[PDB]
Amino acid sequence: MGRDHTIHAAVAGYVKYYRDPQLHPDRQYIGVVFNRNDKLPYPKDAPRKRKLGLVA
Amino acid sequence: GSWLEPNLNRKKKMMKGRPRVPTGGSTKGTTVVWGDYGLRMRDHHRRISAQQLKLAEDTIKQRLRGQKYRLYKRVACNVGVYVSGNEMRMGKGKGSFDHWATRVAVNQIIFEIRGQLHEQVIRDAFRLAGHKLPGLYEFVKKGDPPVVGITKLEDGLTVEDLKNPRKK
RNA sequence: GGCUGAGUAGCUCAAAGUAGAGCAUACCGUUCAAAACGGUAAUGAAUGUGUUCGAUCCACAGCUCAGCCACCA
RNA sequence: AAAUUAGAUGUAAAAAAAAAAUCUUAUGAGGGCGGAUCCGCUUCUAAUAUUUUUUUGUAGUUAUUAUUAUAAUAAUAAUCAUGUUUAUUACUUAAAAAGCUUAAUGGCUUAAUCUUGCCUUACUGUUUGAUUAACAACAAAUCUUACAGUCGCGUAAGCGGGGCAUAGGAUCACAAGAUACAAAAAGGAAAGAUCUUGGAUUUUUGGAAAAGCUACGCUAGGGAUAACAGGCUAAUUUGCGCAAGAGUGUACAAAAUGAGUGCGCGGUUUGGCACCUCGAUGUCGGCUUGACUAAUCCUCAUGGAUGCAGAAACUAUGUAGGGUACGACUGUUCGUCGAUUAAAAAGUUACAUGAGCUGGGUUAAAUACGUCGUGAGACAGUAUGGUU
RNA sequence: UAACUGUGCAGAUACAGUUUACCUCUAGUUAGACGAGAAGACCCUAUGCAGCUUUACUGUUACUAAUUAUUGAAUACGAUU
RNA sequence: UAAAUUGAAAAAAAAUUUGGUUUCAGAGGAACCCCCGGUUAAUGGCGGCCUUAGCGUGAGGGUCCUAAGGUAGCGAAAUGC
RNA sequence: AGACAACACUGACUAGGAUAGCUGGUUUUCUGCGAAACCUAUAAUAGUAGGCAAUUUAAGUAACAUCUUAGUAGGUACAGAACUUAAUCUCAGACAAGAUGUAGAUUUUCAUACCUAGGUAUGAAAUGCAUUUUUUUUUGUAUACAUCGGGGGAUCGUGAAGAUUUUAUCGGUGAGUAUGUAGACUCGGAAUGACAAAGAUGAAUCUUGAAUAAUCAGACAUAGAAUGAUAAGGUUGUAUGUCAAAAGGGAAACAGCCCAGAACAAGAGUUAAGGUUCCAAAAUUAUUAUUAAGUGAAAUAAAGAAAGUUUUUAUAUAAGUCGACAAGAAGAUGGGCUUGGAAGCAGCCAUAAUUUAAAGAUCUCGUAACAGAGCACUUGUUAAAUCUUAAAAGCAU
Ligand SMILES: [K+]
Ligand SMILES: [K+]
Ligand SMILES: [K+]
Ligand SMILES: [K+]
Ligand SMILES: [K+]
Ligand SMILES: [K+]
Ligand SMILES: [K+]
Ligand SMILES: [K+]
Ligand SMILES: [K+]
Ligand SMILES: [K+]
Ligand SMILES: [Mg+2]
Ligand SMILES: [Mg+2]
Ligand SMILES: [Mg+2]
Ligand SMILES: [Mg+2]
Ligand SMILES: [Mg+2]
Ligand SMILES: [Mg+2]
Ligand SMILES: [Mg+2]
Ligand SMILES: [Mg+2]
Ligand SMILES: [Mg+2]
Ligand SMILES: [Mg+2]
Ligand SMILES: [Mg+2]
Ligand SMILES: [Mg+2]
Ligand SMILES: [Mg+2]
Ligand SMILES: [Mg+2]
Ligand SMILES: [Mg+2]
Ligand SMILES: [Mg+2]
Ligand SMILES: [Mg+2]
Ligand SMILES: [Mg+2]
Ligand SMILES: [Mg+2]
Ligand SMILES: [Mg+2]
Ligand SMILES: [Mg+2]
Ligand SMILES: [Mg+2]
Ligand SMILES: [Mg+2]
Ligand SMILES: [Mg+2]
Ligand SMILES: [Mg+2]
Ligand SMILES: [Mg+2]
Ligand SMILES: [Mg+2]
Ligand SMILES: [Mg+2]
Ligand SMILES: [Mg+2]
Ligand SMILES: [Mg+2]
């Protein structure tokens, strides 16, 4: 989130508009997933899906 | 305030606006809820002024004076009409306050009366009040069905039968 | 028709942390009586509603208003 | 009426176990099969969630009551408690409002608010990706990323390139610091260049140092734009009708009369719009000469009239053939007035008619009065004169 | 090179519909051809002009004031110090 | 900036004096102006409010302000909406 | 007198040296493509620049457009009254127990007197209706303990004071899943439109390189708004199209409307909008109703009136509907009051009865007041075998 409350992308992925009732009951979030077919919010018990983002 | 002079500020101007035109099957305000009889506008939606409604009440009181009745008003003059001079030119802002008014939809009740009087004595009172009000009015009893648009829900007709694309 | 400036004691006029000073009025005393005179007292911020810690004061809408502009065919 | 202080929701805190099913997930079994970790199909296992689901268990401790032989069993009640009871901890307590630098809007209560400790990243250079390619261009802007340098806070993770967000104008010139670039013969210097920074109603705020008259006026243009008339419109009118009936009429609504209203016609007023005409549509009254409309002043036929005895008159229905004159006042249309008359009504036609006339008014040059302006001058202020 | 009503850049000899009219001159007359004449003086526009006005901006002068120079003395009186 | 002196004398400036060059600086010191006064047949300017011998009228009496408050005369006027 | 200074003078004539963001004009043909009247800036608004973007022809395309399937953003119409706004309506209070009284029935239980455990006596209680109870000197339960002032009246009362109760009076407060209201209310919520992904289709329609314009006075129709006056061929936005720059057919005539995009000819060719008796190409084509007014027939004049007509739905009728005609339409009683007078009939109050085939203490006239004539209502006669009355709707006047 920016200084003026602007939501940017931190990684190369696909935008998602969802609600996470576990984190906060009355909030709506925006996220970026690496796979277009992913579904947010991820289950709290699933491993973090992260990309390397490095070149050898 | 009152039903002809609300507790609003004349400084803050209002737009012209338009009366409510229910196009979704709304019977809001088309029935007698308090009195035994009513006065229904049955031609078109308008914007009645506080001066035309004040004369209607005075016309009913003059005809029913000396008798026991209870007149209910189902409309409130809560729309401030602002008029610029008919001699002025176009532009130079909006006009100044002229009078209070109320927007009435079609087939909506205006007045309702409840008293120990004869039906025909009330008809003449509502008949005289209609000749001095803008538009055409109708005598309505209590218990009769509501009106969706310009069609009455009579003979088992429901709002879903009017929404059904097939009617023939 | 269209803008502007004013409104405080009975009468005058002065003044966002105040309402003052005159004249008039009243009581008494001076004179045979009255006036003048002398002494001692009491009198107000229009009409609401807002702003402000607090409004004669700033803002807004009415009443009273006065003043000014209503030009070219 | 208005000063301070103390209050203003409820719940939980011994503890579960097991069976199946419906999905969803898995960087689980490197599952299997087609093409270890790539992809669509795929069983199994695990986890979260969901069924009102099939249930099982709900004790122990203290005490009471009853039975049984102080103990056992059953039921009932209380039970967060090894802990300074001012307990404590977790969860819950609508919305609005308060607070968050200033208006308004949105947002924050799990922090962007408040309290306290230590601090001053309100850092230097460069740089990424965006604002569906900022403002429907450019520029001045806004948010964000990374590397290097070196500082703060924090156990740590990490956070920090000012403030919860959205409202502070350049260049030039000028002034203060730095860089070591160039130095018009040469050594210096001056005056320049780069980097950082300051002083602006440059408020016509993409940024000129800036008052009026013209009726003596001129040129280039405009029906892209006013005055006259036409067109559209019909608020309004000095033009009318219909409906209803408060009330007046000694009585009795509708003989007459008709509050405040409603539904309309009409195109004769004042307006609104700016469609035609500014390489040109002459204008208020008067005279002359018409034509037409009918919402009728007179004349003709006629209904109603406690309020039509007669007469006269009122009102209304037919009806526009003819007539509606004279004079004083005013530029006047209009209007006032005198005296006659059967009566001395109106309107449309470019408010009919100036290539038919007149020119008194309005509206040029001259001049004066009053008023306004510092003045030149101006004036729906008034005067005398002024190529038709 | 007719009349009416309607239409239309919104007032038609020329368009629509209907009506009326044998061809062609002469003398009269001026209702229309938004008749002719003068690229509207009115009004507005142009970062167009001209003259005039003033405590408009920026300037030049008449005029006023001081002084080097042409130009030398002498007492004073006095002040700076 | 040149020379000299001084200083530094380490990779070194820096300061003073003089020549040349280029800036800052103002005790005293004119008119207009400031200050004082005069001038209206100079340009020009020449006001409000309440109160009353009864209603009335307002001689009279209250006060505010100005440089002064329009005097004589004229007056629905070439001036009056 | 801005008067005159030789056509000209608010500054002559003549020679030399201008500009004009303004108006007007710009000359042959064929062929291809094809705008705009918008945004931003401008001492700028009838000018200009940069964009959007027209053109040329090269290189690219996982281009562009459209549909399908899945997904996302956002709150309009609508609907609703939650939050907020205006106004209006209803309510502001109940049960259980206990307690406090009364007429009883005189049975049972209990407490006393006893008596000899019952009975004999004395009290209470039970049983039935009242009474007290939302803050009371009445606790509990359920709920928002659930309401505060002005004023009016009444009953007390003090030297003026005020104190204490009531109201279907005004304002305020609380409750309501009560009614309405909406540019700055949206709890609920479309379609449309927008964004991106894959697939498919299609007329290259897209992007970039190079080269390089015009336009920046728009108009109307339809929908929905602001403004005006719910006027304008009005002004200003939005959505779509046409005109502009588009001829042709239809709308009598026609920039903007309904169709349809003109390269040139032929055809009783095939069709759109629109039409088919004649002018004038094609039906005097079939079916069922309505209208009698030339209504109307290609630009709907309103409210409103009415034995116009038709249909439908009710309803009356040989138990004689409907209409007419004949008679009756009483009595207590001139109701009471008022009034000079009020007898049904100026006005005020009352208007349970009585007797009848039926008859209002009275609906329209009449009288100074009575009288009198009609009506409601009642009987009879005449007489209809699809034929009464009223309403609604359709088309007409
Ligand atoms: K801190
Ligand atoms: K050099
Ligand atoms: K003369
Ligand atoms: K034209
Ligand atoms: K002529
Ligand atoms: K221009
Ligand atoms: K072509
Ligand atoms: K083409
Ligand atoms: K919503
Ligand atoms: K006809
Ligand atoms: Mg009406
Ligand atoms: Mg803060
Ligand atoms: Mg852009
Ligand atoms: Mg600007
Ligand atoms: Mg800008
Ligand atoms: Mg003159
Ligand atoms: Mg025009
Ligand atoms: Mg008669
Ligand atoms: Mg004749
Ligand atoms: Mg004329
Ligand atoms: Mg003529
Ligand atoms: Mg015509
Ligand atoms: Mg022809
Ligand atoms: Mg002639
Ligand atoms: Mg012609
Ligand atoms: Mg000096
Ligand atoms: Mg001196
Ligand atoms: Mg005088
Ligand atoms: Mg002159
Ligand atoms: Mg001359
Ligand atoms: Mg366009
Ligand atoms: Mg500029
Ligand atoms: Mg228009
Ligand atoms: Mg226009
Ligand atoms: Mg054009
Ligand atoms: Mg066409
Ligand atoms: Mg035809
Ligand atoms: Mg054929
Ligand atoms: Mg034929
Ligand atoms: Mg009586």
- Burial annotation B100-122 (CB, 10 A radius, 16+ → b, else e): bbbbbbbbbbbbbbbbebeeeeb
SS3 B129: helix
Residues 135-154 in B having a C-beta less than 7 A from any atom of strand G are 136
Nearest to B142 by CA among B107, B104, B109: B109
Query: Which tokens hold the place of B65?
Result: 């004076």
In sequence order, what are the residues at sequence separation of 6 or more whose Cβ sits closer than 8 angstroms to the Cβ of residue A33? A13, A14, A16, A40, A49
Compute, in angstroms, the gap from residue A32 CA to the centroid of ligand 21: 87
Residue B29 has phi, psi (to 5 degrees) of: 90, 25
What is the distance between the alpha carbons of residues A9 and B154, in angstroms, rounded to a whole number?
Answer: 61
Residue B41: how many CB atoms within 10 A of its CB?
Answer: 24
What is the distance between the alpha carbons of residues B149 and B159, in angstroms, rounded to a whole number?
Answer: 10
- Count Cβ atoms within 10 A of the Cβ of residue A38 and give its class: 0-12 exposed, 13-18 middle, 19 or more buried: middle
Contact (CB, 8 A) for B53 and B102:
yes
Nearest to A11 by CA among A39, A30, A32: A32
CA distances from B55 to B50, B78, B106, B134 (A): 9, 18, 21, 11
Residues 91-130 in B having a C-beta less than 7 A from any atom of strand G are 91, 94-95, 103, 105, 108
Method of structure determination: cryo-EM
CA distances from B35 to B13, B68, B142 (A): 35, 13, 7
Nearest to B31 by CA among B133, B105, B91, B115: B105
Query: Which tokens hold the place of B77?
Result: 């003059």
Nearest to B130 by CA among B59, B44, B46: B59
What is the distance between the alpha carbons of residues B24 and B103, in angstroms, rounded to a whole number?
Answer: 19
Residue B20 has phi, psi (to 5 degrees) of: -75, 130
Q: Give resolution, Å, one decimal.
A: 3.0
Is the shortest CB-to-strand distance from B137 to strand D under 7 Å? no
Residue A2 has phi, psi (to 5 degrees) of: -85, 175
Nearest nt to the CA of B136 via C1' is G303
In sequence order, what are the residues at sequence separation of 6 or more whose Cβ sits closer than 8 angstroms to the Cβ of residue B4? B50, B53, B54, B77, B100
What is the distance between the alpha carbons of residues A28 and A18, in angstroms, rounded to a whole number?
Answer: 6
Compute, in angstroms, the gap from residue A5 CA to the centroid of ligand 15: 25
Is the shortest CB-to-strand distance from B93 to strand C under 7 Å? no
Contact (CB, 8 A) for B136 and B72:
no
What is the distance between the alpha carbons of residues A31 and A41, in angstroms, rounded to a whole number?
Answer: 9
Largest distance between two CA atoms of chain A: 44
SS3 A54: coil
Is the shortest CB-to-strand distance from B28 to strand G under 7 Å? yes
Is the shortest CB-to-strand distance from B89 to strand C under 7 Å? no
Is the shortest CB-to-strand distance from B61 to strand D under 7 Å? no
Is the shortest CB-to-strand distance from A17 to strand G under 7 Å? yes
Please give the annotated binding residues of B for Mg(2+), written as ranges.
130, 133, 135
